[PDB]
Amino acid sequence: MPSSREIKRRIRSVKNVAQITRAMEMVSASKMRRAQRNVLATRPYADRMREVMANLTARVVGAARRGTLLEKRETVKSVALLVVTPDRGLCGSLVAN
Amino acid sequence: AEYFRDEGRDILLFIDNIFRFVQAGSEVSSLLGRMPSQVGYQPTLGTEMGELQERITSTKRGSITSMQAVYVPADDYTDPAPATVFSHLDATISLERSIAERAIFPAVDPLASTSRILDPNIVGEEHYRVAQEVKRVLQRYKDLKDIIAILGMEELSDEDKLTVQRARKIELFFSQPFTVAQQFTGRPGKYVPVKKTVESFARLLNGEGDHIPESFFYMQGDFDDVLAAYEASQ
């Protein structure tokens, strides 16, 4: 028994935490729905680009060093990495993963 | 015991549940018509505690190495009887129900247990440094318990994550199989010297054992036993 007042204050603080996290969960679900809608809107453009690229790559065979960005350059010595991470925390294990 | 103390012989005094002494005094005082103090306790609680405890002290003729047990009513450490006992000691060990229910059966709370000879001049520089760093790590864990409870481990910083992992390994590592406790835990009794304890906890704090999972620190001896168990599991 610390005190009735102190435990009541802790109860109020944790209730405020619960309300804040509930609001965060709701807005995160809304943002997830909007992001899924954006992904589905972007998808037809990517599909058409992929189909056109597939046709073009099937067209060209054994070219001069197989283009520039399509070049299968042997003796790999330098690799660049594009890692995408959230701008803010509170995601969970996602950033760590 | 005072006869053997007065003639020079060393004395190992074990008094089990001083609180039973206090409770008997309280019941007698209630029957004696004295006016009670605090939660039904005798008005003469401090003087009775002084009368018993001051005869326990070691003197120049002979020494008494006392090891008392003190019952805590409910789990209230603010009860007048343990509170009066607290100031009569050179070393205090606090046993917590939360640690015992977590199966760390030597359920000593390191943050609530102190000692007078925990001084670099008396016990050693490395012993003092290791004990203070262990207590600091456990205090950081206790401060971050509320963060870990609801947000989880992922929100903490990398240093805070490492501190909490070390603190959990330290909490599990304080558990030790006892010779008299072979019936409960099916492990042989283990005796760990103070030098080995200090070296093992220094190695745990240095970074060794970070790759070892927590469960290999439960009910072991020094750090070599933990390493041997981890290599056996491999």
- What is the rounded CA–CA span in Å between residue B38 and residue A58? 91
B104: which residues sit within 8 A by CB, 6+ positions away? Answer: B171, B172, B174, B175, B218
**Closest to A92 (Cβ–Cβ): which among B76, B150, B154?**
B154
Long-range contacts of residues A49-52, Cβ cutoff 8 Å, at least 24 apart: none
- What is the rounded CA–CA span in Å between residue B167 and residue B148? 13
Structure obtained using: cryo-EM
Resolution of the experimental model in angstroms, please? 2.9
Give the residue on B whose Cα is nearest the Cα of A18: B150
Residue A89 to residue B76, Cβ atoms within 8 A: no
- What is the rounded CA–CA span in Å between residue A12 and residue A29? 26
Residue among B9, B13, B174 nearest B103 (CA): B174
**Helix B125-150 with A4-59: angle, nearest 10 deg:** 80
- A90 vs B: CB within 8 A: yes
B65: which residues sit within 8 A by CB, 6+ positions away? Answer: B10, B11, B12, B13, B58
Decide: B160 and B137 in contact? Cβ < 8 Å: no
Q: Which residues of B touch A92 (CB under 8 A)?
A: 152, 154
- A17 vs B: CB within 8 A: yes
Residue B155 to residue A96, Cβ atoms within 8 A: no
Is A22 among the residues known to form the active site?
no
- What is the rounded CA–CA span in Å between residue B210 and residue B208? 6
- What is the rounded CA–CA span in Å between residue B94 and residue B70? 10
**Closest to A96 (Cβ–Cβ): which among B78, B151, B154?**
B154
Q: Which of A7, A56, A91, A95 is catalytic?
A: A91
Residue A95 to residue B154, Cβ atoms within 8 A: yes
Name the residue with tokens 């200090």.
B198
- The CA distances from residue B164 to B13, B143, B215, B222, in Å, are 39, 10, 15, 21
Name the DSSP class of A74.
Answer: S
Bridge partners of residue B11, in order along the sequence: B64
3-state secondary structure of A20: helix
Give the residue on A whose Cα is nearest the Cα of B78: A1
Q: Is the dihedral angle over the CA atoms B86, B89, B91, B97 positive or is it negative?
A: negative
B67: which residues sit within 8 A by CB, 6+ positions away? Answer: B12, B13, B14, B15
**String of DSSP letters for A38-71:** HHHHHHHHHHHHHHHHHHHHHH--S-GGG-STT-
Name the DSSP class of A32.
Answer: H
- The CA distances from residue B219 to A55, B99, B100, B193, in Å, are 65, 14, 13, 16
Q: Which residues of B touch A17 (CB under 8 A)?
A: 150
